[PDB]
């Protein structure tokens, strides 16, 4: 529990699923981002109880939760500050003119965070470039892991909703609501595709409906130009029709390191 007296709001960073997000200072020294939770957007009591578990989740490649302000409405979620914002927008800026080695490093950053979460049996459920952030040193970190469970918007949580992550979901999620470590694995493969295609929308010429049909037929995303045979094999391995044939994040990390050494 952070005392709100220790927080200074400085600028607005934008709006997400839970409302306004601000940049500020913690104890007059530390850069922070602060979610101001819009009343009605979150299952607040449930979040508050889980907050402890999530505060114990500490990894260099996870956006660090610093604390909460819950003795007030609206409640605050105080986190690490990531100066360069959203990985998706970051990818779409042509000026960065990324080398492929830099692209693979983004993949490795995320894979490292996901391996940690996997070892803690903790699912993200909404892994995508939009939900990764970039700090001042170009380091990519995974944001809002596990927070999907507290969203009240039916357009987001329902498979047929307009905001559901259809293009990042394996067939068994869309057809059966079968969520597992292997559904996070699938989404990671799609994230790799996002990175290597420099922020293109997956299945960019299809609707959400057509995408579901496509992956049910055993068909998959094409190799991004910038991805080698080896890089494509890795992301593709994440998209095996049988969930238990998909790799673990530990195996993926090993494969990424291999490619780094080889290419
Ligand atoms: C994270 C974030 C959001 N989005 C959400 O809050 C949200 C997203 C999904 C969601 N769902 C439900 C739960 C499961 C996942 C899906 C719920 C909430 C909105 C606005 C800012 C930040 C933000 C945060 N943090 C922790 C930051 O550090 C940060 N930093 C920024 C830094 C710079 C910019 C910026 O303005 N630019 C423009 C100039 N460029 C040079 C740099 C980037 C923006 C954000 N922004």
Three-state secondary structure along 91-116?
HHCHHHCCCHHHHHHHHHHHHHHHHH
For residue 148, give the nearest of 111, 199, 105, 187 by alpha carbon. Answer: 187
150 close to ligand 1 (CB < 6 Angstrom): no
Residues paired with 133 in a beta bridge: 86, 141
Q: Are residues 62 and 101 in the same domain?
A: no
206: DSSP letter:
S
Contact between residue 127 and residue 184 where contact means Cβ atoms under 8 Å apart: yes
Q: Which of 81, 107, 124 is the last residue of a domain?
A: 81
Q: Are residues 86 and 76 in the same domain?
A: no
- What are the binding residues for clofedanol? 79-82, 147
CATH of the domain at 2: 3.30.200.20
Question: Which ligand 1 atom sits closest to the C-alpha of 143?
Answer: 1
- Active-site residue, 154 included: no
Which protein residue's CA is at the shortest distance from atom 16 of ligand 1? 148
132 close to ligand 1 (CB < 6 Angstrom): no
Question: What is the chain's alpha carbon radius of gyration, rounded to the nearest angstrom?
Answer: 18
Q: Which of 19, 54, 81 is the last residue of a domain?
A: 81
Q: Are residues 159 and 180 in the same domain?
A: yes
Q: Which of 126, 144, 153, 154 is catalytic?
A: 126
| Residue in the block written with tokens 């997956």 | 202
Q: Are residues 133 and 247 in the same domain?
A: yes
Cα-to-centroid distance, 109 and ligand 1 (Å): 18
Residues paired with 33 in a beta bridge: 23, 79
Q: Are residues 87 and 56 in the same domain?
A: no
Q: Are residues 126 and 191 in the same domain?
A: yes
Resolution of this model in Å is 2.0
How is 35-93 classified by DSSP, letter by letter? EE--TTSB-HHHHHHHHHHHHS---TTB--EEEEE-SSSS-EEEEE--TT-BHHHHHH-
Contact between residue 168 and residue 127 where contact means Cβ atoms under 8 Å apart: yes
Q: How far apart are CA 171 and CA 186, in angstroms?
A: 10
83 close to ligand 1 (CB < 6 Angstrom): yes
CATH of the domain at 114: 1.10.510.10
For the record, the structure tokens of 140 come out as 């990519």
Domain that holds residue 19: 1-81
For residue 188, give the nearest of 98, 259, 112, 135 by alpha carbon. Answer: 112
**Helices of type H across 148-248:** 154-157, 171-176, 181-196, 208-216, 229-237
For the record, the structure tokens of 93 come out as 């800026």
Q: Are residues 97 and 72 in the same domain?
A: no
Residues 6+ apart with CB under 8 A from 82: 33, 63, 133, 134, 135, 141, 143
Q: Which of 25, 60, 81 is the last residue of a domain?
A: 81
Taking the alpha carbons of 91, 231, 186, 180 in that order, is the dihedral positive or negative?
negative
Experimental determination approach used? X-ray
Q: Are residues 94 and 123 in the same domain?
A: yes
Q: Are residues 91 and 10 in the same domain?
A: no
Contact between residue 188 and residue 142 where contact means Cβ atoms under 8 Å apart: no
Q: Are residues 240 and 174 in the same domain?
A: yes
How many residues belong to the chain? 263
Q: How far apart are CA 169 and CA 259, in angstroms?
A: 26
133 close to ligand 1 (CB < 6 Angstrom): yes
């Amino acid at each position: 529990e952070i005392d709100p007296k220790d927080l200074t709001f400085l600028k607005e960073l934008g709006t997400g699923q839970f409302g306004v997000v601000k940049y500020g200072k913690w104890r007059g020294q530390y850069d922070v981002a602060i979610k101001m939770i819009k009343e009605g957007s979150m299952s607040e009591d449930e979040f508050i109880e889980e907050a402890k578990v999530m505060m114990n989740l500490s990894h260099e490649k996870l956006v660090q939760l610093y604390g909460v302000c819950t003795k007030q409405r609206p409640i605050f979620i105080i986190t690490e500050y990531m100066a360069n914002g959203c990985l998706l927008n970051y990818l779409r800026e042509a000026r960065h003119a990324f080398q492929t080695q830099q692209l693979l490093e983004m993949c490795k950053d995320v894979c490292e965070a996901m391996e940690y979460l996997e070892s803690k049996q903790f699912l993200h459920r909404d892994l995508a470039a939009r939900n990764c952030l970039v700090n001042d040193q170009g380091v990519v970190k995974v944001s809002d892991f596990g927070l999907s469970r507290y969203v009240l918007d039916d357009e987001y949580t329902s498979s047929v909703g307009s905001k559901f992550p259809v293009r990042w979901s394996p067939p068994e999620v869309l057809m059966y609501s079968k969520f597992s470590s292997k559904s996070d694995i699938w989404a990671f493969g799609v994230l790799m595709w996002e990175i290597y295609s420099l922020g293109k929308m997956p299945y960019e010429r299809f609707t959400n409906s057509e995408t579901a049909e496509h992956i049910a037929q055993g068909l998959r995303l094409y190799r991004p130009h910038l991805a080698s045979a080896a890089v494509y094999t890795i992301m593709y391995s994440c998209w095996h029709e049988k969930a238990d044939e998909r790799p673990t994040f530990k195996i993926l990390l090993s494969n990424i390191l291999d490619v780094m050494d080889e290419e």
